[model samples]
Target: RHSLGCYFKGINPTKVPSSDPRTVLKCTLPDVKVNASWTLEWVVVNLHTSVDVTSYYESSPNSEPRFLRAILNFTPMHGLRTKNLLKVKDGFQVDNSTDNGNGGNLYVYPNATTGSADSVRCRLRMCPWTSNSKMTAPDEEMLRKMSEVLNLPNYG
Candidate 1:
């Protein structure tokens, strides 16, 4: 049976603000299929805080591909999931990930296979409660601020 945890991991807390969208977990897998009965109860955001979930595929590690995405708005916190608030889904279907009927109960699609070069990644983003942030996007850039590297001799 295929599972996300068996392949994906949170390498390092991505450099982003608490109020900004950031990558929290990443999954790397070989060509394989998702199990039919597998489910994921992924609680990304904490109580009192609203959050959104989105995912994309990296065909070349740090590079981008054409178009593939998923967005779910979790509101009032999954706490009042007291149905005062709950999980909502936007569309992005690549090896589907859904919440069956429950807010956090993520139901993955059955037997979905991916390519060897394709990588999967997930991000945590903050939204609003009254009427959410509309799943805002994240971004950044850089200069040639390369640091020094020491060329030490190796001893045999």
Candidate 2:
């Protein structure tokens, strides 16, 4: 079936009365306008207690399906945050060894400053080095290897 273009690069329609519907977590990003002057930010979804399943940790089909993490981006890009990104608490660990982004998503956070409006080409990158309750850098290497590049219509 056809899902959102950003979700895969795909969803179910039928509703089963007895069973809980399978919600695609990654496709739950916010909507955007065609001609808006803004910048993009990473709206991290804290999946601390979310249900664990397949394809929930990986960010679609990048160069390869790299491991994911939540919080913090320091790029002085046009429409991005400086250091005001969201943070996690207690860490998203299930047990001692088995953990990480079992069901999490780093959404697009748009911040529109007064400037020339143009298409926002986001180089989304994240890593699995998050320890717990604090923010961690996504690193320069991950930006080259495991980044999800998205081209939006307009951003500041």
TM-scores for candidates 1 onward, in order: 0.21, 0.22
Deviation in Å, model 1, residue 40 alpha carbon: 13
Tens-place lDDT digits, model 2, residues 1-156? 121112121111111132322211232222221111111132222321121211212423232333333322335423643443333231211111126332232212223211211221122222233333343333355333322333323222
Most accurate candidate by TM-score: 2
RMSD of each: 20.1, 16.0
Report the C-alpha lDDT of model 1 over 1-156, residue by residue, as the tens digit.
Answer: 111121222211122223422222222222211111111223323232222443432222233221133445443323444332223332112223333211221222222222211222222221111122442321111101100001111111
Q: Counting only residues 3 or more apart in sequence or on different chains, how many pairs clash (N, Cα, C under 3 Å) in candidate 2?
A: 6
Spell out the clash pairs found in candidate 1: 8-27, 98-107, 128-133
Model 1 — TM-score against the truth? 0.21
User: lDDT per prediction?
Assistant: 0.24, 0.25
In model 1, which regions exceed 4 Å deviation?
1-6, 17-50, 60-67, 73-156
Clashes of each: 3, 6
When summed lDDT is taken over every stretch of 10 residues in candidate 1, the lowest stretch is 141-150
